[PDB]
Paper text:
Flagellar filaments can be neatly divided structurally into the two highly conserved inner domains, D0 and D1, which form the inner core of the filament, and a diverse number of outer domains, which decorate the inner core. Moreover, a comprehensive network of intermolecular interactions connecting the inner domains to the outer domains, the outer domains to one another, and the outer domains back to the inner domain filament core, is required for motility.
Using the composite flagellin model, we built a model of the full PAO1 flagellar filament and then fit it into the density map. Between conformations 1 and 2, domains D2 differ from each other by a displacement of about 4–6 Å and domains D3 differed by about 8–15 Å.
Author numbering:
A (entry chain e): 5 to 53
B (entry chain f): 393 to 440
C (entry chain e): 441 to 488
D (entry chain c): 54 to 392
E (entry chain f): 54 to 101
F (entry chain g), G (entry chain d): 247 to 295
Amino acid sequence: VNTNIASLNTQRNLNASSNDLNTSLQRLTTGYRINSAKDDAAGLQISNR
Amino acid sequence: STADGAQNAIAVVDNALAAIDAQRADLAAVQNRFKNTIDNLTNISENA
Amino acid sequence: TNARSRIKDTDFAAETAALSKNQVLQQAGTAILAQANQLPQAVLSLLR
Amino acid sequence: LSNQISGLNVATRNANDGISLAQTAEGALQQSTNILQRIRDLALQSANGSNSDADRAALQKEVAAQQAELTRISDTTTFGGRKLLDGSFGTTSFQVGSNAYETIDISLQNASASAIGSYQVGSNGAGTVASVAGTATASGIASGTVNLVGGGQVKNIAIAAGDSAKAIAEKMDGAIPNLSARARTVFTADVSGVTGGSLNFDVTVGSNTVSLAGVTSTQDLADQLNSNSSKLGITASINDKGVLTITSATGENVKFGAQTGTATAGQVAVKVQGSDGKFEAAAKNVVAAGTAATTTIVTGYVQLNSPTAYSVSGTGTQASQVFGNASAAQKSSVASVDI
Amino acid sequence: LSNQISGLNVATRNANDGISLAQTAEGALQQSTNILQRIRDLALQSAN
Amino acid sequence: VTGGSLNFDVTVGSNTVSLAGVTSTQDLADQLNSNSSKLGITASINDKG
Amino acid sequence: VTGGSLNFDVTVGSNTVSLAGVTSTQDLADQLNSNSSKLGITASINDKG
């Protein structure tokens, strides 16, 4: 097994964890669990109203 | 200016933000669909 | 405003823990990568 | 021996191809699980407090986009242009031995799509219309020995003449594996004009009996129910429209007693909620000033959610008096799911 | 399989581009939502 | 469309619903977009209407 | 199949079971596949049912 390595699941999990980390960092630096972004559009409408 | 505006503008902004948040919810849908499809896509490419 | 706080402002008491978990998981992933990217090198250098 | 080793080597290679194909399918199924759990989040958030989230259209759009993404996950799995989990899968069988017809079968799912394999539904108005179960009537729930089918565990549920929807649900529950049964009686009311007097009638909800009096408008009966909320465990609701709405979490077969009023003309029409939905348009009164009216009781509906396959039948009235002329749990209806 | 994985990678990159586009759109729409907030503010101030 | 609505049935293979309130091009677009999930359609209105 | 169940006995060599609740092509398939191990047979439903 040398033309490729099956460890690319690690890259997949790393990308997923990095996106989750950016979301958590944004939520922390903004203080809003429901960010002004797309997340929880229903809660977004409730917050807007 | 005097009478109508004070309330007509509310009549505007209510449905205005309603439509804006409708578009924001459509964007939320397409982006969540994008996250799901890109995760599926990485997984199926890795299995392939 | 109490409703808006209940719906918007994060209860970060668990968000900090989630952030620490994400950080240690990322570091663990980099460690797994550093260990796994070295297996084919070893198997080729020792089998050849 | 050379024949044997060659056959075993090529069989090992075919099995490697097969296990890789199976991992592709497993990843597709994992993604469908993620989509379904996200749908569950959006559905329980879709509770909206039942009146608070004015963006119900955008929420249905969100759920519809998630459904379209699920149907796309069904596709795009073309491991060789032969998409596995959706469409028409040939139910292949990988040969793993050095002998003829020595193979290992696989029974991949037909589709992650609509009713083609989502949870089958046994409902009241499923076929055309619903009998006594889920509508008003005079006599009430009659006798019967409705037959149940599924998992080789046929069980003739005995439904006596008079059993409320709650009792019927509790009865059909249990024996049949992975089947559940809820009870629900949702009925509205609308008092008509009262010529010279009011409607002094009664309401027997199960054991206890209401002794209300002086009904001239829907609002009067509304207050009478809201006050009697202690005794009768059935919440009432009158919106700005004018249609008083009464719902029972349990599912008791509400009955309206005799109309011993003092008026001369008038009636109180009621409707009953259907199984799937589409609240009844055709009205029918339970009490009427003057001549005695018909359909004096109100019987709720039940719903038999079924994961894979669950058939039900009944001799004549028995089948109708539960789920009408259904005889099949078909029309899983995950596509038509609304929010 | 090579055709498939190449198509999957380019689809991944196109999906990332689409995610970025939709996120820019979401930022623009939340900005417009803040503008509508300020417009209702000034409108109810116009009661005066 | 004059003097009433053009309410019509939309039959697509197995699943079938019936739209109502048809009075303009955008009206269709919208309601079909609402029912696209059930009917299995892709209702897309372009910039040219 | 009308008015009742098609409960019937399944004899396979030595082991013998008696199926019940079968009312459709899918039903019999599922019930047989459930007991496929005991009977030592291969009950498989195809795409065409």
